[PDB]
A = this chain, B = another copy of it.
């Protein structure tokens, strides 16, 4: 089973992919997801990316408290007291983002589907 595995999955109301965990196989090609922000949905495997961390050189969308969000490229990982941090590079410079500060646009997620998709 996939229960307990960290994933990145599509939130279908806005088309973005967010980090979370599979918590149960609910059949019919779907999995119960506890997203890192607390919300759940039974999601199709085809909309789930089984990839933790998000791989190096992956184009992602990086969030921030002080600036509007945009696309960057993963260039590093770092683990500290049990938490994952990403090093994202935009227009040359690199910066660090918590796991919840990294999401994928619809197309960014659709790109990883062939290699990491559960469907």
CB closest residue in chain B, given A42: B39
Task: Report yes or no: A26 in contact with B44, Cβ–Cβ below 8 A.
Answer: no
* Copies of this polypeptide in the complex: 2
**Which chain A residues in 24-44 approach chain B with CB under 8 Å?**
26, 28, 30, 32, 38-42, 44
Interface flags, A24-68, vs B, CB<8A=1, else 0: 001010101000001111101001000000000000000000000
Task: Report yes or no: B40 in contact with A42, Cβ–Cβ below 8 A.
Answer: yes
Q: A interface, how many residues as a size bin?
A: 10 to 19
Complex CA–CA separation, A26 to B39 (angstroms) = 8
CB A110 to nearest CB in B, in angstroms, measures 14
Complex CA–CA separation, A4 to B42 (angstroms) = 20
Task: Report yes or no: A40 in contact with B39, Cβ–Cβ below 8 A.
Answer: no
Complex CA–CA separation, A13 to B44 (angstroms) = 9
CB A13 to nearest CB in B, in angstroms, measures 4
Q: Is A12 positioned at the interface, with any CB of B under 8 Å from its CB?
A: yes
Residues of B within 8 A of A41 (CB): 40-42
